Amino acid sequence: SKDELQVLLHDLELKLLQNITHHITVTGQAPTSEAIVSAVNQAGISGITEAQAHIIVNNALKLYSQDKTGMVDFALESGGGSILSTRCSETYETKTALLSLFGVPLWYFSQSPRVVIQPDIYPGNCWAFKGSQGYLVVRLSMKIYPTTFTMEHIPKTLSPTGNISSAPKDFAVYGLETEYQEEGQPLGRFTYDQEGDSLQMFHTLERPDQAFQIVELRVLSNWGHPEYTCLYRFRVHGEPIQ
Prior knowledge:
Elements: H1 2-27, H2 33-42, H3 50-63, E1 82-83, E2 95-99, E3 105-109, E4 127-130, E5 134-152, E6 170-176, E7 185-191, E8 199-203, E9 212-219, E10 228-231, E11 233-240
Antiparallel strand pairs: 1-5, 2-3, 4-10, 5-8, 5-9, 5-11, 6-7, 6-9
């Protein structure tokens, strides 16, 4: 069926993306055209050319073009961070067309808020909530003075119409002393810029007076999508208590 098809192409793309991501993480470079030919072959399609592989790699680099820093991420799940799901907006499921590694649009499905704290970024692998206002609360792996936040979204070059209207725009960040604190300490108000890079960093105006192990992200608006907002990744940086 056409569904099974879109699924298999999605899984094929993901294999290639995981390959490329792994290689960049370890070596700091994209793999050669030849390694890509080989990975495509392992995934079950032989006879890809070098020119085709080079196109696949440049398409991948549309997404992985910033060499990101080694700033420790205390929200990252595999580092011990976790979502306090009871305090997030209700998940809203979406199906969105994005430009794939293969140059054609594919269907992608948004997921649960746990994707917000998974490593790296992958097309369509975002958490959607309904409307343009939402809440996410993350328990950090360590108690820290939070000093910097990173928000990531896919670039417009992955949209078949060069458009990311469902991306977060205005947001605010709060430190929560406990899981029940209704009103948290304001850590900052920022705006994700649809004219900026995929990965964007946001710094507190001052070093906070207090350290937190719980952080609340409030998305206050989006870039114009009438039905929902899509959040890909949120990272939390700072200094552990001494």
